[PDB]
Design a protein around this ligand. Structure first.
Ligand SMILES: Nc1ncnc2c1ncn2[C@@H]1O[C@H](COP(=O)(O)OP(=O)(O)OP(=O)(O)O)[C@@H](O)[C@H]1O
Ligand SMILES: Nc1ncnc2c1ncn2[C@@H]1O[C@H](COP(=O)(O)OP(=O)(O)O)[C@@H](O)[C@H]1O
Ligand SMILES: Nc1ncnc2c1ncn2[C@@H]1O[C@H](COP(=O)(O)OP(=O)(O)O)[C@@H](O)[C@H]1O
Ligand SMILES: [Mg+2]
Ligand SMILES: [Mg+2]
Lengths: 242, 45, 49, 48, 49, 77, 48
């Protein structure tokens, strides 16, 4: 009785997407939102049910923020490429001649693909083709990261791979984990026992160590091997000391 | 000039000295020549 | 202490030795009284260290 | 590319998995009932 | 006195086991000395004294 | 992948801490044709999943046991 | 905003509820920042 309760059950995802795409500078914000919100609904109601799937408002917010960020990066790459190739840089045509739909699809594939099961990837790409016709996703090939992964795997007796070779899938998973670490500060590697998760993140950490020159320190904590009081802390009932 | 030559002779004796090991019933490789090693240590000290 | 040698006994002795020699953890599974701890201790008498 | 086939494929997957699970559980139940097999913890809970 | 006499195993099993452990340690030390017969190499063995 | 990792570790890391590593390389060379896709070990492991076991069967449990006792075979040699 | 302002005027608290991900904490923080207030977020558990 001391609080006034309000039921906040269905956020207006379409208006949120439209306004947040309009603010970031997307000229086609209306159609992009009307194509991306039903896309998330289609993913929710068409992909296989898994305990690690979320297609809610947080996922949509992450997709929109990442789409904006990669749009700024694409503007910057167009700037430098035009500068090194000639002198014709102007904001008008570059903003006009910008694949915004490709940017949105790139953000979606960077955020949603790594969490899908093997069988749902064709499902997601079919949904992308249905809702976003003609737009294709061509993931970047981080070269120096790949040779650094090669060196790290060779040093620690691990089997590197590429494409369809033995080791290609695990390297692809490492690259997706790297992308998600760049995008998100909260990571979960979900998969059956002994699927290569530990080696994947160790190899990624050592590759980033040897590439960027900053040293990576990993703290491995078993949250259930100790009580929650030992995991987070105790407040003394007597002395009120932490 | 004399003192350093004492140092170099001790250096070469102790970097070329080897323990005298021989076989013992095909079970191990035991050491003999305790007296010579001990006398060398006393004289060097 | 005494253990009567048997086919299963010697086979499990060999397996336990070839598993504990390299300090690999293991679990003996079976009904109570089957001889799991007897088999383990009889494999430990061959490893005095 | 057909969404209807996608939904139907999910439905048949879930139905087949549940049907196999239920039939296997019932077979274990009837085998326990004739004394052919011993009753396990999961079987104990299912019978209870 | 331990290996040559086989009756001491019956009378002193734990003594024989302890001496066997000491004998393995001493034989490891002997092998380490034999592979490097130099006096200083023996002296620089970690925790030799 | 796991077979390649085990073979590389056998050919690289000595078990004592060299004759031992030479024995390791020879044993790995002898075991190479069996540690392949659709090899004896792969087919046996596939068939092992069809049997009933006292506990749930995990591929890495059997693989680790096999690798451990292969190391012990190297120690025996 | 309407419900929380009505609660505040009556000197009552605000208790937005619903499934996770609907923007309840964010809405509370946005309302507090709209009035220029210092909004503190506490993750409550059994130790509080
Ligand atoms: N890319 C790889 N190539 C070869 N061997 C690998 C590779 N990745 C992992 N392994 C090996 O296979 C096993 C997998 O262990 P790993 O720690 O990677 O699994 P995991 O999925 O993190 O395990 P869990 O979740 O059960 O702790 C280990 O023995 C590891 O050395
Ligand atoms: N091969 C055997 N030789 C002698 N005794 C045996 C043999 N196999 C089983 N036993 C007897 O069976 C018993 C096994 O019990 P125990 O090993 O304590 O069970 P658990 O391993 O489940 O604790 C021992 O008391 C032992 O005397
Ligand atoms: N009206 C809105 N406009 C833009 N983003 C929103 C809106 N409502 C919620 N969000 C986004 O949803 C995400 C999760 O909301 P949050 O308040 O954490 O949900 P919960 O009520 O479960 O805590 C936030 O990151 C926020 O940015
Ligand atoms: Mg792991
Ligand atoms: Mg919240």
């Amino acid at each position: 009785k001391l609080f006034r309760s309000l039921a906040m059950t269905k956020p207006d995802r379409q208006l949120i997407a439209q306004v947040m795409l309009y603010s970031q500078g997307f000229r086609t914000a209306e159609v992009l939102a009307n194509k991306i919100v039903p896309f998330f609904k289609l993913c929710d109601e068409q992909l296989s049910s898994q305990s690690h799937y979320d297609f809610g408002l947080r996922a949509l917010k992450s997709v929109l923020v990442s789409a904006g960020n990669v749009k700024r990066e694409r503007i910057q790459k167009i700037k430098r490429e035009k500068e090194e190739r000639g002198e014709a840089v102007d904001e008008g045509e570059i903003a006009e001649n910008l694949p915004e739909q490709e940017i949105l699809i790139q953000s979606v594939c960077e955020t949603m693909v790594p969490k899908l099961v093997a069988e749902d990837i064709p499902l997601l790409f079919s949904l992308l083709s249905d809702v976003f016709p003609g737009v294709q996703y061509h993931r970047g090939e981080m070269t120096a990261l790949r040779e650094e992964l090669k060196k790290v795997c060779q040093e620690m007796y691990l089997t590197y791979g590429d494409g369809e070779e033995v080791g290609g899938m695990w390297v692809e998973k490492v690259l997706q984990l790297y992308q998600i670490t760049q995008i998100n500060h909260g990571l979960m590697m979900v998969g059956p026992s002994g699927s290569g998760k530990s080696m994947a993140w160790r190899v990624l950490l050592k590759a980033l160590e040897r590439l960027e020159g900053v040293e990576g320190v990993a703290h491995i904590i078993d949250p259930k091997a100790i009580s929650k009081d030992h995991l987070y802390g105790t407040l003394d009932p007597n002395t009120r000391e932490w | 000039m004399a003192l350093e030559e004492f140092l170099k002779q001790i250096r070469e004796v102790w970097n070329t000295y080897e323990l005298d090991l021989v076989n013992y019933q095909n079970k191990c490789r035991l050491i003999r020549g305790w007296d010579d090693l001990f006398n060398k240590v006393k004289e060097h000290i | 202490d005494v253990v009567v040698p048997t086919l299963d006994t010697v086979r499990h002795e060999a397996l336990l030795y070839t598993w504990l020699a390299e300090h690999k953890p293991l679990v003996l599974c079976g009904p109570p009284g089957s001889g799991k701890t007897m088999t383990l201790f009889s494999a430990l008498r061959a490893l005095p260290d | 590319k057909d969404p209807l086939f996608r939904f139907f494929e999910r439905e048949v997957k879930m139905g087949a998995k549940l049907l196999q699970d239920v039939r296997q559980d019932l077979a274990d139940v009837v085998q326990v009932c004739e004394g052919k097999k011993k009753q396990t913890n999961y079987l104990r809970t299912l019978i209870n | 006195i331990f290996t040559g006499s086989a009756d001491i195993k019956h009378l002193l099993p734990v003594e024989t086991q302890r001496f066997q452990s000491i004998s393995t340690e001493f034989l490891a030390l002997m092998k380490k000395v034999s592979k490097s017969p130099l006096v200083m190499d023996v002296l620089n063995i970690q925790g030799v004294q | 992948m796991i077979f390649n990792n085990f073979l590389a570790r056998l050919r690289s890391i000595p078990l004592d801490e060299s004759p031992m590593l030479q024995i390791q390389r020879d044993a790995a060379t002898i075991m190479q044709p069996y540690f392949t896709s659709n090899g004896l070990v792969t087919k046996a492991l596939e068939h092992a999943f069809q049997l009933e076991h006292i506990m749930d069967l995990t591929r890495l449990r059997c693989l680790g046991s096999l690798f451990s006792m292969l190391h012990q075979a190297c120690r025996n040699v | 905003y309407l419900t929380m302002t009505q609660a505040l005027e009556a000197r009552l608290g605000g208790s937005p509820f619903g499934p996770a991900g609907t923007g309840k904490t964010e809405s509370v923080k946005a309302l507090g920042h709209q009035l220029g207030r210092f909004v503190l977020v506490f993750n409550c558990d059994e130790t509080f």
